[PDB]
Amino acid sequence: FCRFTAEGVQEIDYKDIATLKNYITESGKIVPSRITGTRAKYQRQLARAIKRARYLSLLPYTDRH
Amino acid sequence: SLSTEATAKIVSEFGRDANDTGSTEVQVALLTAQINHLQGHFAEHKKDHHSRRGLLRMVSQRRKLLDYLKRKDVARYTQLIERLGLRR
Amino acid sequence: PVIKVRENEPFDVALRRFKRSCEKAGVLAEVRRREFYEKPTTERKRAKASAVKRHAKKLARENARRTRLY
Amino acid sequence: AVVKCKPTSPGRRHVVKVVNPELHKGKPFAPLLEKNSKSGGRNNNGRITTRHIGGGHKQAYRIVDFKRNKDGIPAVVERLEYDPNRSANIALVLYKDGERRYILAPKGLKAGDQIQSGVDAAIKPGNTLPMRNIPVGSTVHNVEMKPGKGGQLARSAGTYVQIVARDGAYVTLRLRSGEMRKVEADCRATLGEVGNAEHMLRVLGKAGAARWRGVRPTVRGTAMNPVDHPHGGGEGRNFGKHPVTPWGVQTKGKKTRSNKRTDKFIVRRRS
Amino acid sequence: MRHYEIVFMVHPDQSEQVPGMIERYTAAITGAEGKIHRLEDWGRRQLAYPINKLHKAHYVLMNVEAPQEVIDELETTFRFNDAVIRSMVMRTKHAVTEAS
Amino acid sequence: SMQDPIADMLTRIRNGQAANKAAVTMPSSKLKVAIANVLKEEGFIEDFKVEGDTKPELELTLKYFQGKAVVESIQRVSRPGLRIYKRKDELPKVMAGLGIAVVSTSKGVMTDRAARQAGLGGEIICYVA
RNA sequence: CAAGCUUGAGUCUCGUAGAGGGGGGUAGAAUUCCAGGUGUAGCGGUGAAAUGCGUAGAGAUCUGGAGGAAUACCGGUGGCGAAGGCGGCCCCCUGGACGAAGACUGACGCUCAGGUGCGAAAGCGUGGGGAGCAAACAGGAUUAGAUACCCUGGUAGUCCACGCCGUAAACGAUGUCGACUUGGAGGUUGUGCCCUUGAGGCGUGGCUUCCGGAGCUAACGCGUUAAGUCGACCGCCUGGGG
Ligand SMILES: [Mg+2]
Numbered sequence: 001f002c003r004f005t006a007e008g009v010q011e012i013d014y015k016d017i018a019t020l021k022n023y024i025t026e027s028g029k030i031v032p033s034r035i036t037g038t039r040a041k042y043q044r045q046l047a048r049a050i051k052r053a054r055y056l057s058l059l060p061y062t063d064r065h
Numbered sequence: 066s067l068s069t070e071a072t073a074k075i076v077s078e079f080g081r082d083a084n085d086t087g088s089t090e091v092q093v094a095l096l097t098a099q100i101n102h103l104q105g106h107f108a109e110h111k112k113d114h115h116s117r118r119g120l121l122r123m124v125s126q127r128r129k130l131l132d133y134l135k136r137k138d139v140a141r142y143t144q145l146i147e148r149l150g151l152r153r
Numbered sequence: 154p155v156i157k158v159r160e161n162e163p164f165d166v167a168l169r170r171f172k173r174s175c176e177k178a179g180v181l182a183e184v185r186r187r188e189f190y191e192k193p194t195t196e197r198k199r200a201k202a203s204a205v206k207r208h209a210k211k212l213a214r215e216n217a218r219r220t221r222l223y
Numbered sequence: 224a225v226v227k228c229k230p231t232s233p234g235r236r237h238v239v240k241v242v243n244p245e246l247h248k249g250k251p252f253a254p255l256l257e258k259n260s261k262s263g264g265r266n267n268n269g270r271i272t273t274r275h276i277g278g279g280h281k282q283a284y285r286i287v288d289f290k291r292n293k294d295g296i297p298a299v300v301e302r303l304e305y306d307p308n309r310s311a312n313i314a315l316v317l318y319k320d321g322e323r324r325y326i327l328a329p330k331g332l333k334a335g336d337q338i339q340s341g342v343d344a345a346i347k348p349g350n351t352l353p354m355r356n357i358p359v360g361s362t363v364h365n366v367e368m369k370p371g372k373g374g375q376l377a378r379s380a381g382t383y384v385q386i387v388a389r390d391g392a393y394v395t396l397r398l399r400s401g402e403m404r405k406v407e408a409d410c411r412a413t414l415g416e417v418g419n420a421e422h423m424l425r426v427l428g429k430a431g432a433a434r435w436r437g438v439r440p441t442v443r444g445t446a447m448n449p450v451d452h453p454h455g456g457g458e459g460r461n462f463g464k465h466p467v468t469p470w471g472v473q474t475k476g477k478k479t480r481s482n483k484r485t486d487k488f489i490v491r492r493r494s
Numbered sequence: 495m496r497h498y499e500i501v502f503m504v505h506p507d508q509s510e511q512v513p514g515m516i517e518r519y520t521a522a523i524t525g526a527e528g529k530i531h532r533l534e535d536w537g538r539r540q541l542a543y544p545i546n547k548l549h550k551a552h553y554v555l556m557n558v559e560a561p562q563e564v565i566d567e568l569e570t571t572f573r574f575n576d577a578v579i580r581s582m583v584m585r586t587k588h589a590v591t592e593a594s
Numbered sequence: 595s596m597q598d599p600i601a602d603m604l605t606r607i608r609n610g611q612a613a614n615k616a617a618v619t620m621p622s623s624k625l626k627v628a629i630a631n632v633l634k635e636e637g638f639i640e641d642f643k644v645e646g647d648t649k650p651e652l653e654l655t656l657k658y659f660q661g662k663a664v665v666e667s668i669q670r671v672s673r674p675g676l677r678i679y680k681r682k683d684e685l686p687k688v689m690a691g692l693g694i695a696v697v698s699t700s701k702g703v704m705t706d707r708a709a710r711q712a713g714l715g716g717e718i719i720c721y722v723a
Numbered sequence: 724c725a726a727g728c729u730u731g732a733g734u735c736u737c738g739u740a741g742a743g744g745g746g747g748g749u750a751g752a753a754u755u756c757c758a759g760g761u762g763u764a765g766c767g768g769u770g771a772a773a774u775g776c777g778u779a780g781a782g783a784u785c786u787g788g789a790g791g792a793a794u795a796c797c798g799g800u801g802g803c804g805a806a807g808g809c810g811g812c813c814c815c816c817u818g819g820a821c822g823a824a825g826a827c828u829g830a831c832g833c834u835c836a837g838g839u840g841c842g843a844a845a846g847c848g849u850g851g852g853g854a855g856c857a858a859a860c861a862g863g864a865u866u867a868g869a870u871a872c873c874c875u876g877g878u879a880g881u882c883c884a885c886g887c888c889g890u891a892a893a894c895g896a897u898g899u900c901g902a903c904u905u906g907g908a909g910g911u912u913g914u915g916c917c918c919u920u921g922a923g924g925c926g927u928g929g930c931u932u933c934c935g936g937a938g939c940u941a942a943c944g945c946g947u948u949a950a951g952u953c954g955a956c957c958g959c960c961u962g963g964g965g
Pocket residue numbers: none
C-alpha cells in the first residue's frame with residue numbers, strides 16, 4: 001500500500017533529512033501527492049518541513065547554486 | 066483568550082456552587098472579563114476588522130443575558146451590574 | 154537537469170537522457186505558461202474546465218463500457 | 224499632532240498647527256543659555272550680503288552638545304524642550320555624575336530613557352558610538368565628518384543617514400539628499416533618527432506668520448526696472464530672456480559645485 | 495512559560511568559541527528561571543548552498559523551555575552576534591530528544 | 595426556530611402518506627393528542643400511541659385502502675401568523691360535508707359537524723379531506 | 724400572572740484542522756540598473772517588416788553591488804472566513820468552527836422598517852517608494868482611412884501609512900431561521916468498537932463535489948446543501964421605451 005507516514009502517526013520534523021529526501025525530485029521540487037500516495041493530512045506537514053529545511057540550508061532550493 | 070486559571074476563578078467567585086458554571090451571573094462575568102482584556106488589543110491594532118466582529122458578538126450576548134436577568138429578578142440584576150460596573 | 158555523461162556510451166543516448174530530464178522536470182512547459190500574464194479569473198476558470206472535463210470523461214466512460222456498439 | 228484651525232478670521236482658515244503636549248512648558252535651563260543678537264544679513268562691512276533677512280522674535284541660544292564625548296557614565300532624560308534655533312526639539316539630559324547637557328531628541332526618546340556614548344554602548348536609539356561598531360545597514364543621525372569635529376550630517380527635524388557599506392578605513396553613507404559619501408570609520412554617530420517629523424505638515428497661513436520667523440518679503444525680478452535686475456524691463460509683463468540670478472549667473476539648471484579637493488569622498492552625485 | 499527549538503549556525507572560522515558562547519546563552523535562560531532540555535551540538539556541517547560565501551557552518555540545537563521575554567531578548571543577541579548566521583526559533587511539542 | 599407545532603404534525607402525516615410510510619413519530623402535546631383523538635374516530639388514521647415519560651413521542655399509524663392513500667389533503671387554516679375564529683352559523687363545510695374540519699370549541703376539540711350539532715364555534719385548526 | 728420542565732438557546736472541562744485578522748522580522752529564484760573582465764558584429768521584433776539598441780563597441784558570458792515587487796514545486800471542482808476576500812518561513816496579539824464524555828442556567832428564542840459596522844477593482848487627499856507591467860502620450864507598421872488590434876518606448880497607477888469613496892455579472896442571477904421526505908460515487912476533518920490480528924471490517928459526527936428517484940414547472944432543469952411538503956419575519960415586482 002501507500003502507507004508510509006500514515007503508519008507512523010506523528011509530526012514530520014526537518015532534522016530527519018533522509019526521510020525528506022525521498023519526497024523531493026532531482027531538482028528539489030516537492031513531489032506531488034498523486035505519486036507518493038500520502039494522504040492530505042501529512043502532505044502539508046511534509047511540505048512545511050521542506051520549506052523549513054531549505055531555510056536552514058539542509059536542502060537545496062534548486063539544483064544550481 | 067481567558068486562560069483556564071482566570072476562568073476557574075470567576076466561576077467560583079460569582080457562582081452559587083463551585084460547579085455552577087452556566088448561570089447568568091457567571092456567564093455575564095466571564096463575558097465582561099474578556100471584553101476588558103480585549104480593550105488593550107484593539108487600542109493598538111485598530112484595523113483588526115475581523116477580530117472586532119467577534120467582540121461585538123460578546124457585547125450583544127452579554128446584553129441579552131442582562132435583559133433576561135432584569136425581567137426575571139431585579140434584585141439579582143442590581144447587584145451584578147454594581148459588582149461589575151456597567152450600564153452607563 | 155544536470156546530466157553527467159557516463160563512460161563513453163553514445164552521445165545520442167546522453168542527449169535522449171537530457172531530453173527526458175526536461176520532460177520529467179517540466180522546464181519546457183513552465184516557460185510557456187509564464188511568458189504572458191493572464192488575469193486571476195482566467196486562471197480560476199481554466200482550472201475549472203480542466204477538472205470538469207476530466208471528470209466528465211470518467212462519467213462518460215461508464216455509458217460505453219457495457220453498451221454493445223455493433 | 225497636526226490640527227486645522229477654524230476659519231474664524233481671514234488668515235486663520237489655512238493654519239495647521241503642529242502641537243506636542245509633551246514639551247516642557249516652563250523656562251529653559253539657565254547655565255546653558257547665551258546671548259544671541261540678530262544681524263539682518265549684514266557682514267562686518269555693514270552691507271547686506273544675503274537678502275530677505277530681518278526682524279523676528281528675540282531668541283536666546285541654547286548650547287546643544289554635538290560631540291557627546293563622555294564614555295560610559297549613563298545619563299537619563301529629564302525633559303524635552305522647544306528650541307527656537309532649530310527644527311528639532313532638544314532634550315535636557317542628566318548624567319549619573321551630576322552634569323546636565325542639551326542633546327538632540329530622537330524620535331523614540333521619551334522623558335525617562337537612559338542613554339550613553341562610547342564603543343561599549345548598546346545598540347539602542349539615542350546612544351552614541353563610532354561607525355566601526357554600528358551594524359551596517361542601520362539608520363543614523365548626528366554623523367561626524369571628521370573624528371572629533373562634533374557632528375554635521377542629519378541634524379534637521381526627522382532626517383537620518385543610511386550606512387550602506389564598509390570598505391577598509393572608510394564607511395559609505397547614503398545621505399538624506401541622495402548622495403553617497405565616504406566618511407572615516409572613526410567618526411561618531413548617534414544611533415536612531417531625529418524626532419519631530421511633523422515639521423513638514425505646518426502651513427503658516429498668513430503673511431505675518433513668516434515675518435516673526437525673520438523672513439522679509441521677496442520682490443521678483445520681473446517687477447523691477449532694467450537697472451535693478453537682469454530680468455527687469457518690460458512695458459506690460461515681458462520676459463524674453465533666460466532666467467538668471469540678480470548677478471547675471473544662470474539659474475534653473477546650471478551647476479555651481481567646484482571643490483576638487485573633496486571629490487575623493489563622493490561615490491556618486493546627488494540624484 | 496513557552497517551549498522553543500532554537501537552532502543556529504556559527505560560521506566556521508569562529509567555531510573555536512562555540513562552547514564558550516553556548517554557556518552564555520544558557521546562562522541567561524537558567525539565570526532567568528528557565529530550563530534547558532537538549533544541547534545537541536551538530537558540529538561542523540556543510541550547507542546545501544553558500545550563504546553568500548562560506549560553504550561550511552557549525553550547527554547548534556537548544557530546545558529551551560523559558561519565558562517569552564528572555565527568548566525575545568535572546569533573538570536580538572543572535573542578530574548582533576557576528577559569528578551567528580540564520581538563527582531559528584520554534585514552538586511546542588514540549589519534551590523531545592532525538593535526531594542527532 | 596419553529597413557531598407552529600400543529601402544522602408540523604400535519605406535515606409529518608402529509609409527508610408520510612406521500613412517501614408511503616407505515617408510522618410517523620413526533621414530540622407529543624395535549625393538543626396533538628386531542629387532534630389525533632379526532633382523526634382516529636373519523637376513520638382517517640388507525641390507533642395512535644403516546645408512549646414516553648419525559649419525552650413523550652406521539653406515534654400515528656397511517657392507513658391505506660389501495661395503491662393510493664386515505665388522507666387526500668390536510669392543510670393548516672388558523673396559522674400562528676393569522677388566527678381564524680368562526681361562529682356557529684358560519685362554520686365551514688369541507689367538500690360539501692364529505693371531509694371533516696377540526697374546530698376547538700369551548701367544550702373541546704370536535705369536528706365541524708359535531709360543533710353544529712352542539713351549537714358552538716371556535717378556532718379552525720385544519721381541513722382534512 | 725404564578726410555579727415548574729427539558730429537547731430549543733448558552734456556559735465549563737479536553738482536543739483537533741485550517742491562504743481567518745493585525746503587527747514585526749528573514750530568506751531563495753528571477754527581472755531591471757550600476758561598476759568592471761573576455762570578445763566580436765550584429766541584437767531585438769513580426770504573418771513580413773520598420774521604428775529602437777550597436778564599432779562611442781552592443782547582444783552573449785563572468786565577478787561585485789544597490790533597489791522594489793511577488794511568493795515556482797507543494798496545489799488539490801483542497802481549506803478558512805458573514806460577504807468582499809485570504810498562498811514563502813518565523814515570532815506575538817486575536818476571532819471563529821467542529822468532535823467525545825459529562826456537569827451547569829433553564830425559553831434566556833427566530834426575524835427585523837428606521838439605524839449602525841464591514842465592503843473587490845478603478846478613483847480622490849497628504850506624505851513616502853518606484854524594480855517590472857502599464858491608461859494617457861510619441862514613433863513604426865497593416866489599412867481606402869486605423870484616433871484600434873500588432874511592434875519599439877512610456878507618465879499617472881499598481882506598493883506602503885493615515886483618511887475619503889461605498890459602487891460590480893458584489894452571481895450557487897436562488898433572503899434568514901426551523902421541521903419532514905427513496906438512493907448512489909467521491910473529497911476533507913474528528914471519534915468508538917472489533918481482528919492494535921498488519922493493511923482492515925463495523926458505525927456514528929461536521930463541511931463539501933458529481934449523477935440521479937418520487938415530486939415540482941413553460942421548458943430547461945432542481946432534486947435531503949431542493950427550485951419538493953410546510954411554518955415565522957423581512958426586502959422586492961405589476962407591459963416595452965422615455
Ligand atoms: Mg465564548
